[PDB]
C-alpha cells in the first residue's frame, strides 16, 4: 500500500515539518537512534567510521529503520552486542504527501481529477546533502573490519551512493587522535555519561578548580 | 474553458518603448496642500514686497 521510494527520492519541495499547521502526521518508523554500548565512556572506543552520503536526496524513515536493523544485527552477531556504539545522525522531519486517486473501474465518474489536489501526509523522510553523515559508529581498533562490513551491508538499504570513511577524530568528539591524546594526558578532560567535558581558559577560577583538578595539580 | 489568469510578461518592454520619462520640474511649484495659515500670511508678505519694490522703482 506504500508507494516506491523513487516517487519521493529528490528534494523537490520546501521542508514540510510537523507543526500546528499539519496536526495530523503518521509517526516515524525509526524510533531508536543510539544503540550498541551507548553508555560506554569516551576513551573506550577510539576509532570512528562514518557512512556518509554522496547525493542530495531524501532518505525514508523506513529505509533508515531497515539499515539500522541490518547493521546492528550484523555487528551484534559477528562481534558482540557491546563492542560498538552506533548512532543514526539523521532524523526524518520532512513530511511526504499523497493525492490519493481511486483505483476503481469508472473512477472518473467520481474522481474530480486534479481539482483540489493538495495531498495528505503518509510518510516521513530525512533530507540529506553532499557529504552529510547518515551513520556513525565508534569502536576499538580491533573491530574496524567488522564495522566497515556492517556499514557496507547497511548501504544496500539506501538509495543513491554512500561512502564509508574512517575518520581521523577520536570517537564521537571533534579533536584529532594525537590532539585528544595530548589533551587527555593532562587532566583537562573529564568524562560524562558518554561524552567528555573540556577545560577552557575562560570562566571563574573557583569553578575551574572544583571541576578538573588534576590539570591544576601541576 | 479555463484561461490564463495574470502575467506581467511584455509589460516592461511596453513601458520602455516610449516609457519612463521623469516628470517635468518647475520653478515655483504648486502651493496646494500647504498650510493655510502660512499661505494667508504669504499673500500679504508678497503684496507688501511688491508695493515696496514698486515704490522703489516707480
Amino acid at each position: 500500500a506504500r508507494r516506491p521510494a523513487r516517487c519521493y527520492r529528490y528534494q523537490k519541495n520546501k521542508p514540510y515539518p510537523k507543526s500546528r499547521y499539519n496536526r495530523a502526521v503518521p509517526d516515524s518508523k525509526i524510533r531508536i537512534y543510539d544503540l550498541g554500548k551507548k553508555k560506554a565512556t569516551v576513551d573506550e572506543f577510539p576509532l570512528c567510521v562514518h557512512l556518509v552520503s554522496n547525493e542530495l536526496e531524501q532518505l525514508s524513515s523506513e529505509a533508515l529503520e531497515a539499515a539500522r536493523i541490518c547493521a546492528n544485527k550484523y555487528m551484534t552477531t559477528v562481534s558482540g552486542r557491546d563492542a560498538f556504539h552506533l548512532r543514526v545522525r539523521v532524523h526524518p522531519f520532512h513530511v511526504l504527501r499523497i493525492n490519493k486517486m481511486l483505483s476503481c473501474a469508472g473512477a472518473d465518474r467520481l474522481q474530480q481529477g486534479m481539482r483540489g489536489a493538495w495531498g495528505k501526509p503518509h510518510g516521513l523522510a530525512a533530507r540529506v546533502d553532499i557529504g552529510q553523515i547518515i551513520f556513525s559508529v565508534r569502536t576499538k581498533d580491533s573491530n574496524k573490519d567488522v564495522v566497515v562490513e556492517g556499514l557496507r551491508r547497511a548501504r544496500y538499504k539506501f538509495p543513491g551512493q554512500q561512502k564509508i570513511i574512517l575518520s581521523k577524530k577520536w570517537g564521537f568528539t571533534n579533536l584529532d587522535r594525537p590532539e585528544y591524546l595530548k589533551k587527555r594526558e593532562a587532566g583537562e578532560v573529564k568524562d560524562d555519561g558518554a561524552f567528555v567535558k573540556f577545560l577552557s581558559k575562560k570562566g571563574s577560577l573557583e569553578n575551574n578548580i572544583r571541576e578538573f583538578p588534576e590539570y591544576f595539580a601541576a | 474553458a479555463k484561461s490564463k489568469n495574470h502575467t506581467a510578461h511584455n509589460q516592461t518592454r511596453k513601458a520602455h518603448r516610449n516609457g519612463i520619462k521623469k516628470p517635468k520640474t518647475y520653478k515655483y511649484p504648486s502651493l496646494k496642500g500647504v498650510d493655510p495659515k502660512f499661505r494667508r500670511n504669504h499673500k500679504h508678505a508678497l503684496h507688501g514686497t511688491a508695493k515696496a519694490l514698486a515704490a522703489a522703482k516707480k
Partner: protein
C-alpha cells in the same frame, strides 16, 4: 479570497528591531525640518499615527509643508510608464535627514573654499571629481622579502 490591506505583508518591515523597542529618544523630536530638505522615510512601528504606506519605506523625498507634528514630503512613484507626484503627511518619528545631501553641501563649501584660495594664484583648480585611476609604476624590493614558493595542497577528508 485574496487579501491586500493597508498593512499587508508588513510583518518584518514594521517590527521594531532586536533590543531597541520601547519609547523613542528625543533627538527625533528635537530635529528641525525646513521646506526643501531632503529626507529618508523609515516607519516606526511604535507610533501608529501618521504612518507611511509600505511602498514608501526606504524612499527619499523633499519637504514641501511643515505643520505642528508632521511633515509633508513629495515622492515620485512609478505608475505604469511614467512617474507621478505623491504628497505624504508623515509624523516626524518616521523621517530623518538624508546624509548624502549634507555630504554634497560639505563638498560644495570646501570646493568653493578651494576655488577662492586658488583664485589668488590661478593654478588650474581642477575641481571636478575623478574616479579610480589605474595605479602607476612602482619598484618592489626583496630586502627581507624573498619570495616564498607555494604549491597546491593534496586532497584530504577532513571530517
Amino acid at each position: 479570497g485574496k487579501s491586500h490591506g493597508y498593512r499587508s505583508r508588513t510583518r518584518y518591515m514594521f517590527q521594531r528591531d532586536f533590543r531597541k523597542h520601547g519609547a523613542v529618544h528625543l533627538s527625533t523630536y528635537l530635529k528641525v525640518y525646513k521646506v526643501g530638505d531632503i529626507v529618508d522615510i523609515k516607519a516606526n512601528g511604535s507610533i501608529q499615527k501618521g504612518m507611511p504606506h509600505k511602498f514608501y519605506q526606504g524612499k527619499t523625498g523633499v519637504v514641501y509643508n511643515v505643520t505642528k507634528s508632521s511633515v509633508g514630503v513629495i515622492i515620485n512613484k512609478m505608475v505604469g510608464n511614467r512617474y507621478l507626484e505623491k504628497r505624504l503627511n508623515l509624523r516626524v518619528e518616521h523621517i530623518k535627514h538624508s546624509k548624502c545631501r549634507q555630504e554634497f553641501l560639505e563638498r560644495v563649501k570646501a570646493n568653493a573654499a578651494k576655488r577662492a584660495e586658488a583664485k589668488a594664484q590661478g593654478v588650474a583648480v581642477q575641481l571636478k571629481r575623478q574616479p579610480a585611476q589605474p595605479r602607476e609604476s612602482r619598484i618592489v624590493s626583496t630586502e627581507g622579502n624573498v619570495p616564498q614558493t607555494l604549491a597546491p595542497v593534496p586532497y584530504e577528508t577532513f571530517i
